[PDB]
Design an enzyme around this catalytic site. Structure first.
Site, PDB file in Angstrom:
ATOM      1  N   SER B  47      30.912  43.643  29.639  1.00  0.00           N
ATOM      2  CA  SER B  47      30.548  44.129  30.972  1.00  0.00           C
ATOM      3  C   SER B  47      31.619  45.001  31.647  1.00  0.00           C
ATOM      4  O   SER B  47      31.359  45.608  32.694  1.00  0.00           O
ATOM      5  CB  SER B  47      30.215  42.943  31.882  1.00  0.00           C
ATOM      6  N   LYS B  50      30.642  48.537  32.158  1.00  0.00           N
ATOM      7  CA  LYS B  50      29.828  48.973  33.289  1.00  0.00           C
ATOM      8  C   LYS B  50      30.542  50.059  34.084  1.00  0.00           C
ATOM      9  O   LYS B  50      29.903  50.821  34.801  1.00  0.00           O
ATOM     10  CB  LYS B  50      29.446  47.786  34.177  1.00  0.00           C
ATOM     11  N   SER B  95      27.168  41.715  37.454  1.00  0.00           N
ATOM     12  CA  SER B  95      27.074  42.106  36.041  1.00  0.00           C
ATOM     13  C   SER B  95      25.636  42.092  35.527  1.00  0.00           C
ATOM     14  O   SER B  95      25.334  41.463  34.510  1.00  0.00           O
ATOM     15  CB  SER B  95      27.935  41.187  35.166  1.00  0.00           C
ATOM     16  N   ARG B 227      39.899  33.872  34.132  1.00  0.00           N
ATOM     17  CA  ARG B 227      40.165  35.298  34.015  1.00  0.00           C
ATOM     18  C   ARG B 227      40.933  35.781  35.245  1.00  0.00           C
ATOM     19  O   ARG B 227      41.968  36.440  35.119  1.00  0.00           O
ATOM     20  CB  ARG B 227      38.858  36.073  33.841  1.00  0.00           C
TER      21      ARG B 227
END
Ligand SMILES: [Cl-]
EC number: 3.5.2.6
Lengths: 242, 242
Positions: B47, B50, B95, B227
C-alpha cells in the site's frame, strides 16, 4: 440560516471572559453561534490577515514558494522566534509580523486594495499604514465574514490561482490526527481597543467540514491559550471532535 | 555518508520482531540505519505504492482532484472502512485497495510501466495483474529506494505536474502539531512471503526535514501498530521529535 446556542456562553464564563464562537456545517449549510450580535460585529483582523496577505503575495510573485527564505533584518524584537530567518510556513506558524509587513510593502496599496475588493474581504478598507493597516488601520471584519471568506478558500473559489490557495492552506496546517485535521490562523489585536484574540479556520472530517471563527476579549496576553481551548471545548460539546 | 546504529534493534527486540529503520537528514545529506543490508533489501511495496499510483492517476486525469467521489461498488469486504464511498484523501487514509485497483486499470500497463521508469521507482517491474502487481506481482523496492523516491516528491522533481505532487502530499498528511508534521503512508504485504509492514515518509521541522522508511516482519496483523510506534521511538532517541 443561523441559530443561537447560548449554552456555549458557559465556556467563556468559566474564565470570566467574553467572546463569540461561530460554526458552519458545510454539508447541511447551517450556522451556529452563542451570540448573533457579536458574530456580526467587525473587529481588526490582526494576524488572521496573514491568510489573505499570503494569498496575494503568492499570486503576485512576491513569494515564489513556501521554501523561499526571508532573512531576519537583524533588528532584535521582543518575540524570540521572530529573530531568525523564515519562510511562508514558519512565518505563519509564529505570526511573524515584520515578514508580513515586508510582503505588504512589496504588494503596495493599489494592488492590496484591489485584491481585498475581489476577495470581498471585510469592509475592504486599507486606509492607514500600508504595511500595518491590519494592526492599527481601517480594515474591519466580523466572525461571520471570516467564515464566508474561508469557505471560498477551501473551495478554491477566490480570485487567485489554485496553486496560491493550495499553498496558503498548507501553511494554515495547525493540527492533524486520525480523527480530524485543523487548518487555522490565530490573531491578537492590541493596538486598538477593544483588545481581542482571534481563531479562524476549519475542521476537516472524513465526510464533512466544519468552518469556525471566534473572537474574545483579551485584556492581557495571559489568556491567549483560551482562544484554542474554548473553541475545542465547543467542538467537543457539539461532538465534532472527540 | 552513512552510519549504522545497531542500538535501534532493541526497539524491534522488545516485540519479538525484526526489521529496519532508515533515516535521512536532508540538510546534512547524511543517512542513518540499524541494518545497512536490510535497508537495501527490496520487498513488495504493497500500500505504500498508493503514493506513485495516486501521482499517476492525478496527472493522467483519472482522478480530477482530492474531492472526486469513487462510489462503493456495493460488494461487502472484510475491511469495514472499505464498504463506503471514498475520495483520494480517505482512500489513502484507509488504504482502500479496490479504489486503487480501479486507478491502475484505467491507467493501463503501458502508461504505468512508462511512469515507474520515469520515477526510477524500485526495480520498475510491473509483472503480474495490471491492477495488483504491487500486492502479488514482480515490483520490488527497498527502504533506501523509497527515501530517494520520496525526496523527489518533496522537492516537486518527479516527472508529473507540480499540482499532482502537491495533492498527493496533502493526501499523505498523517499527523501534525506544534513540534512536527508527518506525511507518510503505511503498507502491509501479505500475499507473498515474507509478510511485512511498511511505513515510509518524512518529518517536517521548522528548519529541516527527516525522510524515513521502515519495514518489519509482520507474521500477523496484531503487530501493525508497531510500524508507527517503533519508528517514533527511534525518532525520539535521535532527538528528532520530543
Ligand atoms: Cl497539507
Amino acid at each position: 440560516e443561523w441559530q443561537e446556542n447560548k449554552s456555549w456562553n458557559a465556556h467563556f464564563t468559566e474564565h470570566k471572559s467574553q467572546g463569540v464562537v461561530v460554526l458552519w456545517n458545510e454539508n447541511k449549510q447551517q450556522g451556529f453561534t452563542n451570540n448573533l450580535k457579536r458574530a456580526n460585529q467587525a473587529f481588526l483582523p490582526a494576524s488572521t490577515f496573514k491568510i489573505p496577505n499570503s494569498l496575494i503575495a503568492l499570486d503576485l510573485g512576491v513569494v515564489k514558494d513556501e521554501h523561499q527564505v526571508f532573512k531576519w533584518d537583524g533588528q532584535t524584537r521582543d518575540i524570540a522566534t521572530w529573530n531568525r530567518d523564515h519562510n511562508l510556513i514558519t512565518a505563519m506558524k509564529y505570526s511573524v509580523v515584520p515578514v508580513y509587513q515586508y510582503f505588504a510593502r512589496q504588494i503596495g496599496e493599489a494592488r492590496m486594495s484591489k485584491m481585498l475588493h475581489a476577495f470581498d474581504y471585510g469592509n475592504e478598507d486599507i486606509s492607514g499604514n500600508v504595511d500595518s493597516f491590519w494592526l492599527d488601520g481601517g480594515i474591519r471584519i466580523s466572525a461571520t465574514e471570516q467564515i464566508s471568506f474561508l469557505r471560498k478558500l477551501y473551495h478554491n473559489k477566490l480570485h487567485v490561482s489554485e496553486r496560491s490557495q493550495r499553498i496558503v492552506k498548507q501553511a494554515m496546517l495547525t493540527e492533524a490526527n486520525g480523527d480530524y485535521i485543523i487548518r487555522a490562523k490565530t490573531g491578537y489585536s492590541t493596538r486598538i481597543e477593544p483588545k481581542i484574540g482571534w481563531w479562524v479556520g476549519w475542521v476537516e472530517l472524513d465526510d464533512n467540514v466544519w468552518f469556525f471563527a471566534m473572537n474574545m476579549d483579551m485584556p492581557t496576553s495571559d489568556g491567549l491559550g483560551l482562544r484554542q481551548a474554548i473553541t475545542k471545548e465547543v467542538l467537543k460539546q457539539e461532538k465534532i471532535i472527540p
